[PDB]
Design a protein around this ligand. Structure first.
Ligand SMILES: Nc1noc2ccccc12
Ligand SMILES: Nc1noc2ccccc12
Ligand SMILES: Nc1noc2ccccc12
Ligand SMILES: [Cl-]
Ligand SMILES: [Cl-]
Length: 163
């Protein structure tokens, strides 16, 4: 565990993280895909061997000794708001199980279902609150990666609010 488990947010490419493992915002088929997934495929391509896993689950594949946790959030274009919300919560619970099983002291994590799977809606709060529900009982240092300057401010505020 970390000596004083924390949440932090950084605005940069998750493929340049400084943590002991990474969560990929994966597709169910283990394909190279877009956004975070595209960077993850370029950085850790060996981790995509048998990475296919259903919506609402996480599957870990090693790149050397570095763990890549493939977490499949729902595509809100296809799911109802209700079913989508259930699957997005579930994906994060499976990430918390994997992080605990691996015994890492830190994890880099993107906000699942906020990009091309968002169904054209702002899901910062919905996705972040499911991340907190899952990860609050873990003792890993969590570092959230984002791209947008206004998202960095809102994520930083949400973390600071509960401190
Ligand atoms: N400023 C940036 N260039 O590329 C990125 C990828 C992810 C997050 C931030 C950046
Ligand atoms: N949080 C992110 N959204 O898009 C990205 C692309 C590369 C790495 C991180 C991010
Ligand atoms: N859907 C998004 N717009 O900007 C972002 C920045 C970081 C993560 C997700 C989004
Ligand atoms: Cl960067
Ligand atoms: Cl997404």
């Amino acid at each position: 565990g970390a000596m004083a488990p924390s949440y932090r947010v950084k605005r940069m490419d998750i493929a340049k993280n400084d943590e002991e493992c990474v969560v990929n915002a994966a597709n169910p088929r283990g394909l190279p895909g877009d956004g975070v997934c595209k960077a993850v495929y370029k950085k850790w391509p060996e981790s995509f061997k048998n990475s296919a896993t259903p919506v609402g689950t996480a599957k870990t594949v090693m790149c050397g000794t570095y763990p890549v946790i493939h977490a499949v959030g729902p595509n809100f274009s296809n799911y109802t708001e209700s079913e989508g919300d259930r699957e997005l919560a579930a994906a994060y619970r499976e990430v918390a199980k994997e992080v605990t099983r691996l015994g890492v002291n830190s994890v880099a994590i993107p906000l699942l279902s906020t990009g091309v799977y968002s169904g054209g809606k702002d899901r910062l709060t919905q996705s972040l609150n499911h991340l907190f529900t899952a990860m609050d009982s873990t003792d890993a240092d969590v570092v959230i990666y984002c791209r947008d300057k206004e998202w960095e401010k809102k994520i930083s505020e949400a973390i600071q609010m509960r401190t």
